[PDB]
């Protein structure tokens, strides 16, 4: 049987379960594991983001040492739109307005002069004793201050604890953000995790009644088996089998392992995309589909350049 | 600079050619293998990654009659692109359906 595009467009549908900021559960119905895993792998490792690459330290008197603090700072998500920037070329130590961002972190811990009152907590004894992510100040280079409104280029989370100081200690450094894909380094990955699972279909091969219905309700996840008193006696039925986690606990009950059938619905996926905050997750899934279209267009242009 | 190498067999038939796709892994390879195996005029198709140290895949296509194995490769690329375009349209329409139903049911 050939590839019928019309049959695919009849049987394919997307059902959105829940979408807030930084999470998205949806369904893909009637697509194969090859393409669904392609989308999952693009979301993991090939949708580009902006992340700190070079850290120019000037003074670092903290105990969080320098090459550790650089890696520390590279793992912070930078809330930029990566589609407005470009790849820095091979060998450019100095990036321009097109392809880099700058952040200055300059925090000095001093002792709180007044209002200490011989206490013990560090929040009263010291000032700037914890270096958070709100201390990172964006340094616009070129015309980036006019291109981006104020408060747009920033880290995603302010209150990620970078380091921790004591009086006298100082962190003075400058960060350069570049664009890359998560195949290169995991700091560029835009998702917390992106994954899928096929939808389970639990069916009852035999009517289950009485205390066996309560055992059946407890051998599954809370919610899939609705045990209900129709006559006063209890019968069990499957109600929303999406909740089941395949603990397969019903296969340990010797009597009731013959009345159910756990399988999966073929080609019915449940994706979950959890953005770190760089882009909204529906935008991440759109860009992840466009990446695979770009791969196909890349090799079609290679074939047309050979011909 | 060249991403695609077409390696014909020792026979000059052009019906059994290995495609070497540089800077590529299981994503495009497995999706293309799925879409090329849908072609009735394809005898054999599989991909493999050569070594973990390298970043490329070998992709074999063997056709049956007189068509070269460049035509199923190009047709599989176009069909996978059309698949992804339709998935993009369905996904964006469903997300827009969610954002309109949600913003009006709380008001």
């Amino acid at each position: 049987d050939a590839w019928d595009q019309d049959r695919f467009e009849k049987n394919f549908r997307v059902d959105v379960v829940h979408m807030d900021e930084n999470s998205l559960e949806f369904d893909m119905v009637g697509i194969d594991a090859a393409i669904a895993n392609a989308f999952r792998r693009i979301l993991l490792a090939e949708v580009p983001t902006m992340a700190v690459e070079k850290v120019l330290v000037y003074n670092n008197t903290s105990i969080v040492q320098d090459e550790i603090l650089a890696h520390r700072l590279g793992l912070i998500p930078i809330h930029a739109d990566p589609r407005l920037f470009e790849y820095r070329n091979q060998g450019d130590e100095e990036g321009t307005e097109i392809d880099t961002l700058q952040f200055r972190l300059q925090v000095r811990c001093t002792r709180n002069p007044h209002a200490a009152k011989d206490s013990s907590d560090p929040n009263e004894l010291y000032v700037n004793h914890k270096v958070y992510t709100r201390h990172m100040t964006w340094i616009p280079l070129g015309n980036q201050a006019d291109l981006f409104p104020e408060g747009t280029i920033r880290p995603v989370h302010d209150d990620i604890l970078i380091a921790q100081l004591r009086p006298g200690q100082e962190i003075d450094l400058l960060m350069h953000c570049v664009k890359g894909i998560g195949k290169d380094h995991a700091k560029f990955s835009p998702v917390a995790t992106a994954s899928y699972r096929l939808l389970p279909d639990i069916t009852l091969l035999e009517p289950v009644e009485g205390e066996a219905a309560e055992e059946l309700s407890r051998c599954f996840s809370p919610g899939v088996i609705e045990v209900q008193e129709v006559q006063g006696k209890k019968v069990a039925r499957v109600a929303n089998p999406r909740l089941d986690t395949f603990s397969r606990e019903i296969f340990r009950n010797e009597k009731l392992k013959k009345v159910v059938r756990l399988a999966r619905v073929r080609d019915h996926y449940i994706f979950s995309v959890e953005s770190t905050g760089v882009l909204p997750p529906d935008v991440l899934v759109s860009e992840a589909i466009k990446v695979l279209m770009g791969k196909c267009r890349r090799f079609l242009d290679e074939l047309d350049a050979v011909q | 600079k060249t991403a695609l190498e077409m390696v014909q067999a020792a026979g000059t038939d052009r019906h059994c050619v290995t495609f070497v796709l540089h800077e590529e892994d299981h994503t495009l390879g497995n999706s293309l293998r799925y879409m090329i195996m849908k072609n009735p005029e394809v005898e054999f198709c599989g991909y493999t990654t050569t070594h973990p140290s390298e970043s490329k895949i070998n992709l074999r296509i063997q056709t049956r009659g007189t068509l070269p194995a460049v035509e199923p490769f190009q047709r599989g690329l176009n069909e996978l692109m059309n698949v992804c375009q339709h998935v993009l349209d369905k996904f964006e329409a469903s997300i827009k359906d969610y954002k309109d139903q949600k913003a009006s049911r709380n008001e």
Binding site: R13, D15, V17, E25, G223, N240, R242 | -
Partner: peptide, 8 residues
């Protein structure tokens, strides 16, 4: 783990 909002 929830009934989908967008219908078939």
């Amino acid at each position: 783990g929830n009934p989908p909002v967008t219908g078939p």
